[PDB]
Structure formats: C-alpha cells, structure tokens
Write a protein that binds this ligand. Structure first.
Ligand code: ANP
Ligand code: 3EW
Ligand code: MG
Length: 291
C-alpha cells in the first residue's frame, strides 16, 4: 500500500539531529505505528524524484539486523522515510540512561553490527557511511538493528555539506577521498569504545579520569588528533583481552591493515560473545524503564 502525508497523524517526537527529525506517527489506514523521518531539502523535483526512486531499494533490505522500511515519499520540502518504530531507541540514548554498556552486551551489539554491514555489502553492495551509536536502534524484543545507511547515491550528494564536535569518521575519510567500506569498521570500533567507556573516547581519558569511572575540543584540534595521534584503546584490566584486541583491530589507522568484516566475524571476541547466553531484552528495559 502507498504512503501519503495526510494518512499520518503525529504521536510524539522521537528526536532530531542534523538534517533530519523523526516522529512517532500513526499510519491511520493500516493502524501501524511507524517512525517517520523528515529530511528538509530545497532541491529541484527531478533530483527529489530520483532520491525517492533510489530509496525504494530499502523495500528489499530485509534483515533482523536492519531496520524495517515501510515507504518513502515527498511532502513539502520534506522527504519522508517511514520505518519500523524501535521502542528502545538508539544506543546513544541507552548509553545516556545507562552510563556504560557492559562488555557482554556490547558483544551482542558487535555481532549485530557486523551482520548488518555484511548484509548490506553482501546482498546490496552498499556501504553504511554513518556508523555511530545513534544509528544503531534497539527494541524490547532484543533486536539490534542498523539504520540511516547510505542507500541512495543522490542523497549522499545532496547531503554532502552540513558535522559538529564528534567525528566517527575514519582518518582516511577525514583526510581525503581515498576511502571505502573499511571506514565503517573504524566507525564501529570507536562507537564500541565510546559505549564501553561512557563517553566519546577522544581525547582518551587521563590517568585520573580513568580510575574515577571505575573542556570540549576545537574542531581542527579534534580531527588533528584522530588522524595523527595513536588511536584509542580499551583500558587494560576492566575488559577481557579478547575485547581489547577486537577494538584494536577495528581501529588500525591504515585501512588495508585494519580488520575486515570477514575477519572480525571469526574473531575470538565475536565467537565468545556468539556463545554467551545473554538476556539483552531484559537488560534493555531494566536499564531504561519499560516492559
Ligand atoms: N526508527 C526509529 N525508531 C525509534 N527511534 C528513532 C528511529 N529513528 C530515529 N530515531 C530517533 O531519532 C533520533 C534522531 O535521529 P537522526 O535524525 O537520525 O539523528 P541522530 O542519529 O540522532 N544524530 P545525526 O546522525 O548527527 O543526525 C535518534 O537518536 C533516535 O533517538
Ligand atoms: C546519505 N544517505 C543516503 N541514503 C540515506 C538514507 F536512506 C538515510 N535514511 C535511512 C536509511 C535506511 C533506513 Br532503514 C532508514 C533511514 Cl531514515 C539517511 C539518513 O537518515 N541519515 O541520517 C542523518 C540525519 O538525518 C541517509 C542517507
Ligand atoms: Mg541519524
């Protein structure tokens, strides 16, 4: 069934950020609760049709590790993407409420991210391009799913400009055009360290700030750090050697030396997490108040 603007009714706002705002909406004709992302783009009709056209491939991105798509359309200066509502939010949200995220949980997340990236690359030859904690969604059934990946090339173009004071970009992507899918591996590694530790891990915590857990940077100052200083590490002692090596291999500055999806999928840490009996659903609601 096709989706139009007037068949929707707003319920609440799930949040916003940089070029988009997403609402919890009711799709009146079907009764479904959806998440509807609005993206403002002053752009000619010819290209917006192509964006809408390109976004349709989301209809065949079906995976337990990828957020469900309902449909895409154009309202007034607004491109709408309608998706599965994830009643548990983004990992960046659960991080706030949780402080830190336990290694074993992070292990299940790692599993989901790899399978998600693998699915998108394997079955669609598509690179994510924006891996970070806000674009990993979770829900009360304990599903862990990726969103906001770069499915439409023209959207990639039309969003080219508009970034902030926290980069999840690989150093190769920061420095030039010589980047690709290995960049997502970096984005993952960093995200993990962040969720693991309780904050964006650059710059890395001083001697003091570390034993406590257990000013914001200038733009250039931060990017300069990412590309020229050694990458962040999981602090020793509080995380299994397995986890440490995993993130370490994810955060190699040289993208050709950096681990790939193939390799991470059979890494000691994944295989260990793969076996671990973890009630992720239970932990989720427990730490954010719910079911
Ligand atoms: N399908 C969804 N279900 C539930 N909540 C969602 C969904 N999609 C997005 N959200 C929420 O909307 C918030 C903002 O979304 P979004 O416009 O993609 O920006 P962001 O990921 O937060 N930061 P940025 O990537 O810099 O734009 C996210 O942090 C989520 O909390
Ligand atoms: C660059 N680019 C190319 N295609 C894209 C695309 F489809 C996007 N959205 C999206 C994708 C899959 C699913 Br499932 C759900 C959504 Cl909402 C986003 C995106 O929403 N970036 O979020 C930034 C903040 O608003 C970006 C895309
Ligand atoms: Mg986003």
């Amino acid at each position: 069934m096709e989706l139009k603007d007037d068949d929707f009714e707003k319920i609440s706002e799930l949040g916003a950020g940089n070029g988009g705002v997403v609402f919890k909406v009711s799709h009146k004709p079907s009764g479904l609760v959806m998440a509807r992302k609005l993206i403002h783009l002053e752009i000619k009709p010819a290209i917006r049709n192509q964006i809408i056209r390109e976004l349709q491939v989301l209809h065949e991105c079906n995976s337990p590790y990828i957020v469900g798509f309902y449909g895409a359309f154009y309202s007034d200066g607004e491109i709408s993407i309608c998706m599965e509502h994830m009643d548990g939010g983004s990992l960046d949200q659960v991080l706030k409420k949780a402080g830190r995220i336990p290694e074993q949980i992070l292990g299940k997340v790692s599993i989901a991210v790899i399978k998600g990236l693998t699915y998108l690359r394997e079955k669609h030859k598509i690179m994510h391009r924006d891996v970070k904690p806000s674009n990993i969604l979770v829900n009360s059934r304990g599903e862990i799913k990726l969103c906001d990946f770069g499915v439409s090339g023209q959207l990639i173009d039309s969003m080219a400009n508009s970034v902030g004071t926290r980069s999840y970009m690989s150093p190769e992507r920061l420095q030039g055009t010589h980047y690709s899918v290995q960049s997502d591996i970096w984005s993952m590694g960093l995200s993990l360290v962040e969720m693991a530790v309780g904050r964006y891990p650059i710059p890395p915590p001083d001697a003091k700030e570390l034993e406590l857990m257990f000013p914001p940077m200038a733009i250039f100052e931060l990017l300069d750090y990412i590309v020229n200083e050694p990458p962040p590490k999981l602090p020793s002692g509080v995380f299994s050697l397995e986890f440490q090596d995993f993130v370490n291999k994810c955060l190699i500055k040289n993208p050709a030396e950096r681990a790939d999806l193939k390799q991470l999928m059979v890494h000691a840490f994944i295989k260990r997490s793969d076996a671990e009996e973890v009630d992720f659903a239970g932990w989720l609601c427990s730490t954010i108040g719910l079911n």
